[PDB]
Design goal:
Chain A: It comes from Thermococcus kodakarensis (strain ATCC BAA-918 / JCM 12380 / KOD1). This is part of a larger assembly, with chains A and B. By secondary structure, chain A is an alpha/beta fold. Chain A has five helices and five strands, in the order ααβαββαβαβ. Classes of the chains: A alpha/beta, B alpha/beta. Chain B binds six RNA strands through helix 1, helix 2 and helix 3.
Amino acid sequence: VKRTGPTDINLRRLIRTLRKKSNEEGVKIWKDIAWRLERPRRQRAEVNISKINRYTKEGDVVIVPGSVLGAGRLEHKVVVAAWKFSEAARRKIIEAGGEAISIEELMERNPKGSGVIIME
Amino acid sequence: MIRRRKKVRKLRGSHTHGWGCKKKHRGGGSKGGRGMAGTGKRKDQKWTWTIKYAPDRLGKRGFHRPKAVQYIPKVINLNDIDENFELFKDAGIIYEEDGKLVFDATALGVDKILGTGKLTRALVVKAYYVTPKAEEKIKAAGGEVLLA
RNA sequence: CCCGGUGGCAACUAAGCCGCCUGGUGGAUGGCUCGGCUCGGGGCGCCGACGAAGGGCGUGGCAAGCUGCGAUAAGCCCCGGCGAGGCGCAGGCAGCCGUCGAACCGGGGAUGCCCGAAUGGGACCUCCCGCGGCUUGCCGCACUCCCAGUCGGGAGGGGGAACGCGGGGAAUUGAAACAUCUUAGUACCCGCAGGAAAAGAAAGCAAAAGCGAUGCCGUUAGUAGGGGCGACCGAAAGCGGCACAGGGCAAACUGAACCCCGGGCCGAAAGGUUCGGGGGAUGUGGUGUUGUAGGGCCCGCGGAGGAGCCCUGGGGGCGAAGCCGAAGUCCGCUGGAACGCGGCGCCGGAGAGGGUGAAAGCCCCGUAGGCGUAAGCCCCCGAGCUCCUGCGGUGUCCCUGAGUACCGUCGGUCGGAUAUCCGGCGGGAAGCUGGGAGGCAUCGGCUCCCAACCCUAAAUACGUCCCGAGACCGAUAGCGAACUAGUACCGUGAGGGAAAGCUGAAAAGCACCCCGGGAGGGGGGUGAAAAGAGCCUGAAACCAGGCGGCGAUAGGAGGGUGCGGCCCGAAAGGGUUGACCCUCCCCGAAGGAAACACGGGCGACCGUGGAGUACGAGGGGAGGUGACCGGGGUUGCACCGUCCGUCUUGGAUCACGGGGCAGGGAGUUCACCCGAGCGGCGAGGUUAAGGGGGUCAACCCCGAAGCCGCAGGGAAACCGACAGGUCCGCAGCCCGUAGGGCGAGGGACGGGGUGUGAAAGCGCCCGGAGUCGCUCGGGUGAGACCCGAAGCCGGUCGAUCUAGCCCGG
RNA sequence: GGGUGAAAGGCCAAUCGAGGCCGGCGAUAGCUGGUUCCCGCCGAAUUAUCCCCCAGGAUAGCCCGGCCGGAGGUAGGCAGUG
RNA sequence: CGGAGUAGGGGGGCGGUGUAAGCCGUCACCCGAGAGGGGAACAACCCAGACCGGGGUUAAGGCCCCAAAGUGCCGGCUAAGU
RNA sequence: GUGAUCGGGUAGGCGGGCGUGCCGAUGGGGCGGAAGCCGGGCCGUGAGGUCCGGUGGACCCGUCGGUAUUGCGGAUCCUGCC
RNA sequence: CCGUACGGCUAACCCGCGGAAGCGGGGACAGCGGUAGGUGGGCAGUUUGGCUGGGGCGGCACACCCUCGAAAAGGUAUCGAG
RNA sequence: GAGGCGGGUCCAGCCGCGAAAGCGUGGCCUAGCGAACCCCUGUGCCUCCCCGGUGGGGGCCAGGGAUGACAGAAAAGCUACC
């Protein structure tokens, strides 16, 4: 069966933007994230708060190529970029001192994406 | 969303509609018998399939007790106490006494406390039964059990 | 200008072949629709001895069919409405009815032949034959039963699509055969009711808590359970909702205090009161109707049965046929006709739908919205009138449903399993100091109830009828039937069963002349147009004539490639703003000559130089010329070519199917399971039935009952876990100049829960991703992509053929 | 599944080794016939075990499409160990 | 992870059986499911695997006429149309 | 940009397009002549689309998104005509 | 106590003749109902295998072990040999 | 690709032979037999509808009883009327 891509044109536009940004800034990460967003919907990435806590430390920056969900705890402060956040996940990240932002915001604030952790 | 068309539309002009020779898409003989025919017990045309993909379909094993006697008890784990701390507090369950903070069985009625998770707090747990690891973790976090 | 003889031609020939045109034949396609199908709504919902449904025969001035009516016969009388024409489908000749209010609509009366339950008695022909009694004219005279009683008064019988209650009861089929099973308490048969029927007020459900008559909807659940434990079959309680309602006998005690029919009176009447009869002591009426209880009796204090019914009176409301209901036919062009085009205005709580000589808010009906209403019905104020009556308890006092409960056995049935219900046979209780149930029997506890007698609305099912609506069909479709259709027609009979739509705005449906025995032909007319009833459009196959090309020395499935001849043209293709053709200059891929000078070889030939020259697909330029080209029909020459579909190792086959044309004609729907492509929420996700609102089948809100998941292992009792301890390492990041590090996802160790086991070990599981939708692919079951059996089973019809027997010839 | 039969399985309305009509019935078949537009990308098999199996079916082998994962693999040859 | 089709094979080479034709297996080049050029025509013998329009060179085989290209060259044999 | 290491194909799997009837929207045409029919041109690998002329006399098409009794040469197919 | 066998009786039941009352004959048997065993193509439903140089009879090399066939790894069939 | 059958290498227990090292899970190796359902025996535990006893029933483990058509129907013939 033909693998169409996503039907949200906002995601399609984001993917084009990521590829162009990687060609321009001279890096590999934005391309990587684009091909992970262009993955079939039944196989897309889902990550709970507990995994981020387990594998991060104070002051880390994380990119998730999918949804972030709420199950578990966060015991420090992190900056999480994701395509989608749940209400409870957003609430818990805002508590604990962190920030829950979008991939476009992150590419503005860090064009090279230096230091960023891919979590999928 | 993705509204693809049916393939009879593409098979107009195929002459056989994917089924092969013009003799192969007939009645029950073309399936080897109707339904679960031939699965063994009298005839064996689908016994090879039975022994690969469906053992324990033929035969009997065991006994069931009546529902009038079956009792299914409610249980809870410590991870869940710890992650619904605030709701249990906003509603009755978790409450204060003279000295300490105390958890009560009576949320839905729970006969057992099972010991998966961990405990970050001191707690005075009321429960008809509590498992050894659960009691020990309560201790190691600075609380007590009072069975009821 | 003489002759005679030649080789290529010419050119004209017949049948026949291809193509085009004009006609004939035929009735497709298109456009249209007073007819069908489906869903909603609950409008309406039984007819019949007061002679039904169904059938036969009659009935019109001219009348065959359908429709309507019944010897008063396409109709007779009256009361209201409407407001001038009318005399069925049905476009005629003669006439009649109507303004003294018709036709039509609503309500109500009269007449109403024969058969038919068919009923005074009989039917081989829907026709015949009698009794009485009263005066031809009239009523009555069936069977079975109740009340009676030698007088009479009553009931039943037949019909009805689907829905309803009670009995009797197959085989095909599946199990890849078949016998238990399945098909199936199905098809079909018999009986019995209604607008609904049936059920229904715990000798119940449950289980340490409690519920509280019945019926219906969603879940419980493909679960408990049945079963050659196979194929398959298969509930209930509980939970969430709709809708709500409870009353009466038998007996104990009393003992005629009672009911019905007729006549004499009173009354609107509820119903009183009198004479004469029928019932009833084998008990009419009063009482009373339930769980360790209720009632009776017995003591006693209390004596709100007063709720219903009748309508002189009365108001309101529902409720008709029926009423009212805005705004341009304004000015030009086209046209047979404006509803068109252009211009200029208006109404709108009305721009839904339809009609009118073309596409209309303003021409008409209507529509949005305001109106009124006789009977008939509801509400209440008043009017006249009724049959027994509470509370609290004492008692060695009475009562509370028998071939019943229960046991055994046989047959059927059920998921009901040692534990479902029904029936037959043999046994057979207690009976208030009593009795029953709690999934094998029995003993003891505890819990819940009182059978063997009766009635009962609402919520539910159906649509032979009516109403509205539609991603339904649009005359081979859609119901079989768009129409004089269950009709014509076929069969001894049960029974079977078609075809068939359209002139035009208006009949204006061809006046008049010639020919013809006539049907008709030809001239003339109507009309915007013959569209001429053999009537909208008018395809193909097929046929005739005309035109063009071929056509009597000739060989292949009817075609393909290339080169030519005869003929025709539109301009949608091109072209004098240059067709075709002729010559010269430049670049040029792969490839690649000859003449000629020398030489080698017996020779056919070769080598060297000429020469990588002259040429060469193609890519550019310059001048002479002045009008075709591309295309199409048919046909000649040369080369090539054994049709189409099918199974089959193998088809041109002497293998099967294949005269021509047009229209029709085959993977659908539901339930369950496995996957995917996308989307929403997310340790949670999602509502079902139903309810509330609205501009009322669309829209908005509520509703988590339940289902999946969040913890598993185990036949069961039961027990009950890593939200990260170590390492390798893809992407990626960091340091750098190769190397070196960190490393989600992934992989490997280690550790935990449970089963087994003496244990060690081994299995399954454990470090958070599922759930709800839309579409697609597939599996299983159902007719399951479409057609085809011989046969098996049920109920009915037939002995005018033929076989046998009887009576009379 | 009955009749009738000087017995031939003869006759019972052109129908008889079990009539005819309607129904169950759109019975069932492993057997026969059929299954409607275009262009591109890939592209087989008739062999093993089991079946009252041999004109049928199941489990594998041979085709296609998609996803995961992340560095070696192998249809040929040379030299060797066996 | 998902969707299939296939359970009648044949020519040619190898083996067993059989008088033989054939039967039964095996190899896996071809036909099946494969156009084009040759062998007179030919399923599998030879050359050679095919988008379209053009220009050239070769393969299998062939060069008296039918029929594109030799009545080709040198040495020898056959008298039977072999 | 690369393709000496892409260009046959039965059963069969996968991808993109043409055509038919009805619905929600949007853009439009029609008595100065719609659909349908006959004969001819141009585009398109093609399924097909569109224009010219003639006949006819009242409705029809394009695009986006949905839906379906959605495509015939054949069934000793069915109905009708020859 | 209950039985078995026999003998008798008549009043149930049966038979006949008669409007009926009865009369006569049989007789607790028979018949009727319920259950248990036997016999039972009178009547039904079914089954009656496969391989096989056609089928049939024949034969079971119809599940297994060893040698050969068997092609110097593995695999390999015949109503093939022992 | 496989139910059942057969064989191999071991870990524990309790034992035998042997001075000991060692060997022993039948027969020097390769033939000597068999699903579901039901039943019988052994053994110790789980369980039977509100609770508790008694008799009886169900379940788990092991051994056994058979289908030679041996991956397992309970089963005789004729058709010349067909």
